[PDB]
Copies of this chain bind each other. A is one copy, B any other.
Amino acid sequence: MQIFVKTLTGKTITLEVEPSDTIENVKAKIQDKEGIPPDQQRLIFAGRQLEDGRTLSDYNIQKESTLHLVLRL
C-alpha cells in the first residue's frame, strides 16, 4: 500500500504503508526522508488534521491517497 505526501518543497513523495500504520508512524517515515521531526509535523487529509494516536483506517485513508504536510508552528 502506497500513499502520497505533498511535502514542504512542493514536490510530492511516495511512502509504503500498512492500513494500520498510525499517524505517528507516517510522520516517522517522513523524517526518514524529508528530515522534519514528527513533533514539528502536521498532516492534513480531506480537510481533517490527523491525530498521532489514530490510524490510517480510522481516517479512512485508502491506497494512493494524497496527504498534505505542513509545518507545526
Q: What residues make up the interface of A, taking CB atoms closer than 8 Å to B?
A: 1, 7-10, 18-22, 24-25, 28-29, 32, 35-36, 38, 40, 42, 44, 47-49, 51, 57, 68, 70-72
Contact = CB atoms under 8 A, between A and B. Distances in A.
Contacts of A1: 28, 32
Nearest to A8: B49
Max chain B Cβ within 10 angstroms of own Cβ: one of A10, A20, A22, A36: A20
Contact of A18 (B9, B21, B44, B47): B21
A1 B70 CA distance: 18
Contact of A71 (B9, B18, B44): B44
Nearest to A55: B20
